[PDB]
C-alpha cells in the first residue's frame, strides 16, 4: 500500500513517502492512478516499468544502509537538500540517496564499492545531477568536466553529465536522472566520480 506515493517515491525515499514499516510481503504493491508523491526532484527514472514489475512479488525484504552518511563520505559535503522535496515546510531530500557536493572548496575524485554478501540480490539506486548552468556545476562540484562511473559484472555505465537549462518543473530547471540495477550475490558494484553523483545511501535486499 503506497497511499499517495508512487513506486518511485516509495523506493527512492520521498519524505512525503512515509511508508517505512516496509515489510517482506504483498505480491502486488498499491498505487493511485495518478500518484502525487514520486520523484519530487524532476528528472528521468530509467526502466521504471521494469522495476515496478520486478518489484511486484517480494518474498523477503529489508532496507539497509549501503553507504552510511557519516563514514562513507569523509571528503565531501552530504547536506544537499531541495525545496522541491520538502517535508513540513522545510527543504529536504530523498531518504535513500545522498547529494554529494564540495567540501572546503574541493571535490576530490571518489571511489566507493559495495560487495554483496547477503546471499540474495540487492537493489541499488542512484542519480546523476544535470545542472541548468555551468555556474551551478562549478559551485557544486568544482569542475567543468564531470564523470560518473557505475560498474558491476552485469552493469557498466560511463556517464558524462551535461549542462542544460530545461523548462521549470517543481521550481527547478535542473534535473537528476534516476538509475537502478540489481546486484547479484558475490558481485561488487564500484562507483567512481568527480561530481554530479547523487550517491546511494540505503539500498534494498530482496
Amino acid at each position, epitope marked *: 500500500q503506497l497511499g499517495n506515493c508512487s513506486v518511485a517515491g516509495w523506493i527512492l525515499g520521498n519524505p512525503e513517502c512515509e511508508l517505512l514499516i516496509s515489510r517482506e510481503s504483498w505480491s502486488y504493491i498499491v498505487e493511485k492512478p495518478n500518484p502525487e508523491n514520486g520523484t519530487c526532484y524532476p528528472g528521468h527514472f530509467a526502466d521504471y516499468e521494469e522495476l515496478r514489475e520486478q518489484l511486484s512479488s517480494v518474498s523477503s525484504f529489508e532496507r539497509f544502509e549501503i553507504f552510511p552518511k557519516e563514514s562513507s563520505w569523509p571528503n565531501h559535503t552530504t547536506t*544537499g537538500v*531541495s525545496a522541491s522535496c520538502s517535508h513540513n515546510g522545510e527543504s529536504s531530500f530523498y531518504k535513500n540517496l545522498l547529494w554529494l557536493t564540495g567540501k572546503n*572548496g*574541493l571535490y576530490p575524485n571518489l571511489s566507493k564499492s559495495y560487495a554483496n554478501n547477503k546471499e540474495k540480490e540487492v537493489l541499488v539506486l542512484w542519480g546523476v545531477h544535470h545542472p541548468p548552468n555551468i555556474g551551478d556545476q562549478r559551485a557544486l562540484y568544482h569542475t567543468e568536466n564531470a564523470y560518473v562511473s557505475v560498474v558491476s559484472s552485469h552493469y557498466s555505465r560511463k556517464f558524462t553529465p551535461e549542462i542544460a537549462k530545461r523548462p521549470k518543473v517543481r521550481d527547478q530547471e535542473g534535473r537528476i536522472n534516476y538509475y537502478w540495477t540489481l546486484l547479484e550475490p558475490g558481485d561488487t558494484i564500484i562507483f567512481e566520480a568527480n561530481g554530479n553523483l547523487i550517491a546511494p545511501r540505503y539500498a534494498f535486499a530482496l
Partner: antibody, heavy 125, light 108 residues
C-alpha cells in the same frame, strides 16, 4: 587570512600593453574565480573579467578584444593584459576573488569578497 | 546586459540617523545583488551578498533587502566611519555590472 596584491608598472605608453599581476597569499588559486576590476579617478567601478581556476575566461564585452586574463597555478598568481591602451584606460586597477556560495543548493550566488589594494596605472607618453 | 541605477547620487545624514539608499535593476535579477562600501584610497569592501545576507566582519547595523528589480541598503545608526561611496552590484549574469554609486556625507 587570504590576501591579494597587485603588481606591475604604473606608467604605460599609448598603443602598448598594460600588464598587471596579482599575487595570492594565505590561500590557493584552487577552485575560485579570479577577476580584475578598475576605477578611473572619481568614476565608479567597471568589471573587466575573470578566470576560473581551470582556465575558463569571461570578459567585459567592451574590452573583449584587448583583454587577456591568465592564471598560473604553479606560482599562486594570475595576470591581466590589456592591449593598445589609451588615456581612457587610466585607472586604479584591482584584483579580486569571486567565490561561489550557497546556503542550500537551490540558491547559488556569487560575490567578490577578497580584494587587492589597487594599483594605479597612467597611460601617458 | 543588466544596467544598475543607484539613488540618491549623494546625501548627507547625521550621526545616529537611519540612512536608506536604493539600487534598481533594469530587468529582474531576483536576489542576485551585492553591496559594497568604498572608503577613499581603499579598495571596495563587501557588505551584503545575495541581496540580504550580511557578510562576516561587517557591523550588524548594515542591512540589505529587496528582490526582483528594487533593492535597499540600510544603516540603522549612522557612524562617522560610515562615510564612503556605496555601490550595488548584480551577480545575475555577465558582464557583472555595478551601480554608479551613492556618496554618503556625514552632517555635523
Amino acid at each position: 587570512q587570504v590576501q591579494l596584491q597587485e603588481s606591475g608598472p604604473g606608467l604605460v605608453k599609448p598603443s602598448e600593453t598594460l600588464s598587471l599581476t596579482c599575487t595570492v597569499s594565505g590561500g590557493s588559486i584552487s577552485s575560485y574565480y579570479w577577476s580584475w576590476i578598475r576605477q578611473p579617478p572619481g568614476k565608479g567601478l567597471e568589471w573587466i573579467g575573470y578566470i576560473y581556476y581551470s582556465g575558463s575566461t569571461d570578459y567585459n564585452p567592451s574590452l573583449k578584444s584587448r583583454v587577456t586574463i591568465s592564471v598560473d597555478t604553479s606560482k599562486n598568481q594570475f595576470s591581466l593584459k590589456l592591449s593598445s591602451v589609451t588615456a581612457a584606460d587610466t585607472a586604479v586597477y584591482y584584483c579580486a576573488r569571486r567565490r561561489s556560495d550557497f546556503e542550500t543548493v537551490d540558491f547559488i550566488y556569487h560575490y567578490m569578497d577578497v580584494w587587492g589594494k589597487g594599483t594605479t596605472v597612467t597611460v601617458s607618453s | 546586459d543588466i544596467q544598475m541605477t543607484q539613488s540618491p547620487s549623494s546625501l548627507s545624514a547625521s550621526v545616529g540617523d537611519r540612512v536608506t539608499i536604493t539600487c534598481r535593476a533594469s530587468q529582474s535579477i531576483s536576489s542576485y545583488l551585492n553591496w559594497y562600501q568604498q572608503k577613499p584610497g581603499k579598495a571596495p569592501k563587501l557588505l551584503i551578498y545575495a541581496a540580504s545576507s550580511l557578510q562576516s566582519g561587517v557591523p550588524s547595523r548594515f542591512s540589505g533587502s529587496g528582490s526582483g528589480t528594487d533593492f535597499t541598503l540600510t544603516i540603522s545608526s549612522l557612524q562617522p566611519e560610515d562615510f564612503a561611496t556605496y555601490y550595488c552590484q548584480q551577480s545575475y549574469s555577465i558582464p557583472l555590472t555595478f551601480g554608479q554609486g551613492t556618496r554618503l556625507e556625514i552632517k555635523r
